[PDB]
Amino acid sequence: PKWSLAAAEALCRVFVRLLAAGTIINWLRDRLSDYDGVLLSMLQSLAVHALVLAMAVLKAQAQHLTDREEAIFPRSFFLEIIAVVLESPIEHLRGHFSENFVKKYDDIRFYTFEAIKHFLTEEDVRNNVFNLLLSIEDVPESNDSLENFFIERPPKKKHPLLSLSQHKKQAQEAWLAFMHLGLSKEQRKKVLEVMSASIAPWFTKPEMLMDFLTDCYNSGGSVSLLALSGVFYLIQERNLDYPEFYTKLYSLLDADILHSKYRSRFFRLLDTFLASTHLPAVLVASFIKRLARLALNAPPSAIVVIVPWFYNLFKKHPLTTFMMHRVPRTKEEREKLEKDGLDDPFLPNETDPMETRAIDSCLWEIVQLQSHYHPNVATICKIISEQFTKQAYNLEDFLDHSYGSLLEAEMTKEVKKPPVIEFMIPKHIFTKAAPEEEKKDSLLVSLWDFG
Amino acid sequence: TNDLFAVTAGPRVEIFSIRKREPLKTIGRFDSEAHCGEIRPDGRVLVAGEDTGRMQVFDVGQGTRAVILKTWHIHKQPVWVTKWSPTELTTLMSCSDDKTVRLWDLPSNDPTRLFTGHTDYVRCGAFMPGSANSNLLVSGSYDETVRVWDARAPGGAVMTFKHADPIEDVLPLPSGTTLLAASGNAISVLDLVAAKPLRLITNHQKTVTSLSLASQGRRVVSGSLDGHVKVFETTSWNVVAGAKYPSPILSLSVITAGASHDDRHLAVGMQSGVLSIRTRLS
Amino acid sequence: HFHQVCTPAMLAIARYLGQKVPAALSDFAVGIYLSILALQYQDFAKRYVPEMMNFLLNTLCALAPERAKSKLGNFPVHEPPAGIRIKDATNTPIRQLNCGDCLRKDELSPAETSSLQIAILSTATAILKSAADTWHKLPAFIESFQPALSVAQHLLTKPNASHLPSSLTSKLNDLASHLSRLLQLSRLSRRPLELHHHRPLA
Amino acid sequence: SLVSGEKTNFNHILRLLNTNVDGKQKVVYALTQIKGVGRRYSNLVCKKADVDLKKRAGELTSEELERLVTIIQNPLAYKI
Amino acid sequence: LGTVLNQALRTDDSDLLESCLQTLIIQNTINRMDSSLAGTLLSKLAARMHRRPGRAFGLMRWIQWTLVAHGGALVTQPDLINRLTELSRVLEERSRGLSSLLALKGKLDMLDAQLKYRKALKMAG
């Protein structure tokens, strides 16, 4: 049906020419109606070029299916266009549609959103429309930042298409109706990731997102860890607060969050959350102690981020430095401590960070963590140990670091500087006893049966 | 009868006019920050404290006068509140960052008295108005502890109260008997003749920032991070009036004009770098 | 301090030993394997593997006689997916592990599973002894080994002694006693930290 | 309990083209702090830079920092 | 919008109230809201009612659903019948004209008809 393709495009050509030109007009529009049906089939087929013809005929219809100078276009026709392209399983059709016009044209964007409204009001298709919702990313700045229109920049000077608020309104409604419909777990987490960057900036009012977000934030777990981003976005923009923010943060940080994948974003948020200024010392002390105690079991790809942030916080809050260099003031206490060794006054698993006695503890955890196996990590603990020189450490060079980064680092190291080996290697490498060599057996061999 | 009031915002202060409502003279001799800049009850002295720990005191006439009278460099750690004794011209309280509040005499080169007892940062304070409230000093820490000392016996506080929040502001009353503490979302009216907490009041979401005495010692405006200004009467403490500001606020004051100290105008200071003045004349 | 070849080996060890929630007892076995590898790495260079500590305790609770109920260390606890935990098989005695246990068998006979789990337990028990013996220094001893005691007494609970053999019982009892001894050692010897006694420049 | 310290971190040694050390003093004094640069020369380049003299060194966004860098790089492309 | 209402009511906001009241989810919010704040909400909504008598169509449905969900919350804290007192006083106001408002309605629905009809003559003629 490539000849059918040629017939279709030539029919579009003669159609736009007769529209640019213009008891008979009834059949003259009968032609266009049946051609719309033809184009339904031809998009249900190449369907990308069929889609090109469809936007062309939408253009010609909007241009001259009226007596008025204004360009109304069939929202209904566009609606079934949207219906067929969203039911179609062709990712390439959807991509060409999104990139070519939705990421290009604002008339398309707005009327697209409302077409989505109508169509959703009347699962895999849910995934498709969700993909499209995610595919719209960029929020324009202003009504003069709209500044490009597929058809008919309106001379209304008050038009909904001229007012950014309406496009934000329509996309807002789209997201509202979609979450009102319901969505999957994976859809939920993808939203919760990309929201504050690309979904929360779409709302004329994000307060229902404040609702939904603090619900999944009070839910708990990795979803709530993702929810932190959104709730911070909202408390920053429109100061609708959570009740107990810092105590929530303190108990929120837990065992596995360092092992979570999104700790990078998490740490940038926490960098703000202690970049605040109205913070009491014992609160930031609590966060210090808890983070050291979790660093005792952390991955090193986290510890590399963990340490320089402490250098920062120590630089800002000198009433934390007492956990680094702590003198017994009194000889009486010196007697008491040399007699009875020290117990940690800090309370693990205490809820309120403003009451955990992190003050009067020490960073035994990190000074033991100096004796890590990994050398760069050990040096970074030495940075705490050594002296206070640099005014700050950025973390941006530290973030997003993984075992992958460490392995490619050692890989991209030189092929070989001439290395060293171990001399006088014993022969009884798998021998169980060797009672005649007097060298004690490999612990692995003693605890492993090889036979 | 002045035409002056001070704003402290960043590495500088900007002495403003009440009449013209204009920043008359900026002073940018501050190194790092400037946590409180207040003028002596003359109208000729501005004192202010930087963030390295020095506190500077310098003279200003009406305008372009910044002669640095004295500097003190004792705390080695930022000072957040230096305030004049509203009677004596020569004494000022200074609550630092570290653990300390202390009274300075201007001619003296070492602080007159030092009061301790606080355990966290200390970041609000005031003197005690009233006649027999002679040398009586009140401070709120971040440590959920407000303390009042007498200067006569520099022991601990004579009185202390524990809240559940960081106490971010405080003010006494010109009756010299009762006192506002401001902490979290929760203000607290207290007795100081009986050391008995009268009543907690919470009509804000977020933490408050600042309280301001008003018209005739008869009302108090409060200012909170809720974008919210809310003024109460001092008899029942009901929410009497208030408004909203488009950015969460940090400082607040009404200020009076002249004869009998009718309130000339209020101004709020928001985190968004914006100093809003609402004025009324008569 | 640092090697071109010896250390990336340790890094591969650490990636496996930190990551990979175990789906099978074969994963458990190779975890035991790399744990003792890293022990033979940081012998007499007393460096430290939190990956090994948390992985060992994670395995120790994943054998789930009754349940990881509440507040068992700070190490990330995960769920034994396929019934991969011990039953009341207290009669299958102890044994030493073989490399064939690095093979997957979804058709495994349950008595072999019981014996293999018990052998894994005893070997991890030995690993605990060795790691404590080599890490009695290193001031985070208390905060690193207190969870081991916690897991130990939790497994010493009667709903776990029901499934446990008396051999492993005496094992972990020895563990608790020796570990409490070294804990008291650390507690009495522990001193606060004074790092910035800096020498001023002339 | 949460106030944005988005401006507090400015008392630090700034790196620039030749000297890697320029502290917070003032816009004109930091320009003269850069080697070879005159004081009135600093006046000229900042009043072309449209930056406030009241602004201290480090009170400036990276955009106008590198704007000052390119307009000290080429003093001829902008007229003088 | 439940926490939004909670925040806005207890902080006695104006424009937050406007934002959430411009707009189902309504019902969900009234399920999930609180009690004492809902009574204060009732008070200021009777206030808006008294201030401009323009739309009833959302806000009556709102207070409907308040008395749905936390109706007995005023039974729980029943000192605020003085809040409930004025609503009687408020809703007796809007009943006023109804005592003869229909006497308007018919003679106007009268002249409706022939104006429809002579119009319905008009394209026919």
Structure-token match 């609702």, residue found = A211
Under DSSP, is residue D11 helix (H, G, I), strand (E, B) or coil?
coil
Contact D8 B33 (CB under 8 A): yes
What's the longest Cα–Cα distance across chain B?
49
Read off the amino acid at residue C111.
A
Cα angle value A274/A276/A282 (rounded, 5°):
55
Inter-chain touch A240–E4, beta carbons under 8 Å: yes
| Distant-in-sequence, close-in-space partners of B133: CB < 8 Å, separation ≥ 6 | B172, B176
The CA R_g of chain A, rounded to the nearest whole Å, is: 33
Residue whose C-alpha is closest to residue B9's, from B29, B38, B36, B31: B36
Q: Which of A237, A250, A276, A311 to mutate to test the interface with D (most CBs of D within 10 A)?
A: A276
Q: What are phi and psi of B276, to 5 degrees?
A: -105, 130
Distance of alpha carbon B189 from the chain centroid: 17
DSSP conformation class of C101: G
Sorted by sequence, the CB contacts under 8 Å of residue A294 that are 6+ apart come out as: A253, A254, A255, A258, C74
Task: Tell whether E18 is within 8 A of chain B (Cβ).
Answer: no
Report yes or no: C183 and C146 within 8 Å, Cβ to Cβ: yes
3-state secondary structure of E108: helix
- CB contact D3 to A (< 8 Å): yes
**Where does residue A120 rank: exposed (0-12), middle (13-18), buried (19+ CB within 10 A)?**
middle
**Which DSSP category does D56 fall into?**
P
Do the Cβ atoms of A288 and B127 come closer than 8 Å? no
CB contact at 8 A, A323 and C192: no
Contact A373 C38 (CB under 8 A): yes
Which residues, including other chains, have CB under 8 Å from residue A151's CB and lie 6 or more apart? Answer: A59, A62, A63, A71, A73, A107
- Does the beta carbon of E33 lie under 8 angstroms from any beta carbon of chain A? no
Alpha-carbon distance A124 to A91, whole Å? Answer: 12
CB B120 within 8 A of CB B165: no
Nearest to A256 by CA among A298, A315, A208, A210: A298
Distances (CA, A) of C81 to A256, A332, C18: 18, 56, 18
Burial class (CB in 10 A: 0-12, 13-18, 19+), C165: buried
Q: Are the C-beta atoms of residues A305 and A401 closer than 8 Å to each other?
A: yes
Instruction: For chains A and D, count residue pairs whose Cβ atoms are closer than 8 Å.
Output: 29
CB contact, 8 Å: D4 with chain B? yes
Q: Cα dist. A62→A77, A150, C97, E43 in Å?
A: 11, 11, 78, 51
B236: exposed, middle or buried (Cβ count in 10 Å: 0-12, 13-18, 19+): exposed
Contacts of B66 (CB under 8 A, 6+ apart): B25, B27, B29, B58, B59, B60
Q: After which residues is chain C broken (C to N over 2.5 A)?
A: none
Nearest residue, CB atoms, A392 vs list D4, D6, D12: D12
Please report all neighbours of C, defined by 3+ CB atom pairs within 8 A: A
DSSP C19: S
Identify which of A135, A253, A146, A267 has the alpha carbon closest to the alpha carbon of residue A194.
A135
Residue of chain D whose Cα is closest to the Cα of A273: D2
How do beta strands B228-233 and B239-244 pair?
A: antiparallel
- In angstroms, the CA B25 to CA C113 distance is 84
Among B55, B63, B65, B60, smallest CA distance to B45 is for B60
Q: Tokens for A407?
A: 């392995």
**Residues C55 and C18 sit within 8 Å (Cβ to Cβ):** yes
Verify whether the Cβ–Cβ distance E3 to A180 is below 8 Å.
no
All residues of chain D having their beta carbon less than 8 Å from the beta carbon of residue B33 are 8
d(CA A206, CA E1): 9
Contact E11 B239 (CB under 8 A): no
Nearest-5° Cα angle at B229, B223 to B234:
80
Q: How far apart are CA A444 and CA A446, in angstroms?
A: 5
How far is residue E11's CA from residue C195's CA, in Å, rounded to a whole number?
49
Q: Of A180, A211, A241, which has the smallest distance from its Cβ to E1's Cβ?
A: A211
Integer Cα distance of A74 and A72 in angstroms:
7
Chain B closest-CA separation from residue A334 CA (Å): 23
- Residue B13 pairs in a beta bridge with B8, B27
CB contact under 8 Å between A207 and E4, yes or no, is: yes
Three-state secondary-structure class, residue D4 = strand
DSSP state for residue C48 in the 8-state scheme = B
Residue E93 amino acid letter: E
**Cβ atoms of E5 and E20 closer than 8 Å:** yes
CA E54 – CA B142 distance, rounded (Å): 50
With 0-12 / 13-18 / 19 or more C-beta atoms within 10 angstroms meaning exposed / middle / buried, residue A132 is buried
Residues of chain A in contact with residue E25, where contact means CB-CB under 8 angstroms, are 176, 180, 208
- The shortest C-alpha distance from B141 to chain A (Å) reads 9
State the Cα torsion A244-A247-A252-A254 to the nearest 10°.
Answer: -170
Decide: residue E33, CB within 10 A, 0-12 exposed, 13-18 middle, 19+ buried.
buried
For residues A70 and A159, is the Cβ–Cβ distance under 8 A?
A: no
User: Given B142, B205, B248, which is nearest A280 (Cβ)?
Assistant: B142
Do A281 and B120 count as a contact with CB atoms less than 8 A apart? yes
The minimum CA-CA distance between D28 and chain B, rounded to whole Å, is: 15
The verdict on a CB contact (< 8 Å) between B28 and D54 is yes
Subunits in contact with chain B (3 or more CB pairs closer than 8 Å): A, D, E
Retrieve residue C15's tokens: 């990636």
CA A71 to chain centre: 40
Residue A353 to chain E, least CA–CA distance (Å): 25
Helix (H, G, I), strand (E, B) or coil at C33: helix
How far is B213 from chain E, CA to nearest CA, in Å? 22
Enumerate residues 6+ apart whose C-beta is below 8 A from C148.
Answer: C57, C73, C128, C132, C175, C179
Answer whether B84's CB lies under 8 Å from B47's CB: yes
Quick check: do A and B touch, 3+ CB pairs under 8 A? yes
D-contacting chains (≥3 CB pairs under 8 Å): A, B
How many other C-beta atoms are found inside a 10 Å radius of the C-beta of residue A194? 15
Which experimental approach was used here? cryo-EM
Q: Please state the separation of Cα E11 from the chain's center in Å.
A: 22
Distance CA A431, CA A446 (A): 9
At D22, is the secondary structure helix, strand, or coil? strand
**Three-state SS annotation for chain A:** CHHHHHHHHHHHHHHHHHHHHCCCHHHHHHHHHHHHHHHHHHHCCCHHHHHHHHHHHHHHHHHHCCCCCCCCCCHHHHHHHHHHHHHCCCHHHHHHHHHHHHCCCHHHHHHHHHHHHHHHHCCHHHHHHHHHHHHCCCCCCCHHHHCCCCCCCCCCCCCCCCCHHHHHHHHHHHHHHHHHHCCCHHHHHHHHHHHHHHCHHHCCCCHHHHHHHHHHHHHCCHHHHHHHHHHHHHHHHCCCCCCCHHHHHHHHCCCHHHCCCCHHHHHHHHHHHCCECCCCHHHHHHHHHHHHHHHCCCCHHHHHHHHHHHHHHHHHCHHHHHHCECCCCCHHHHHHHHHCCCCCCCCCCCCCCCCCCCCCCCCHHHHHHCCECCHHHHHHHHHHHHCCCCCCCCCCCCCCCCHHHHHHHHHHCCCCCCCCCCCCCCCCCCCCCCCCCCCCCCHHHHCECCC
CA–CA separation, C139 vs C187, rounded Å?
A: 9
Breaks in chain E (C to N > 2.5 A) come right after: 23
Q: Which value, to the nearest 10 degrees, does the dihedral of the CA atoms of residues B245, B246, B249, B252 take?
A: -30
Which residue does chain B place closest to D26, by CA atoms? B28
CB proximity list for A412: less than 8 A, separation 6 or greater: none
Alpha-carbon torsion angle E36, E42, E48, E53, nearest 10: 180
Q: Indicate the resolution in Å.
A: 4.7
Write phi, then psi, for C43 (nearest 5 degrees): -60, 130
* Pairwise CA distance, residues E19 & A204, whole Å: 10
Q: Is A36 exposed, middle or buried (0-12, 13-18, 19+ CB in 10 A)?
A: middle
Min distance B245 CA to chain D CA atoms (Å): 16
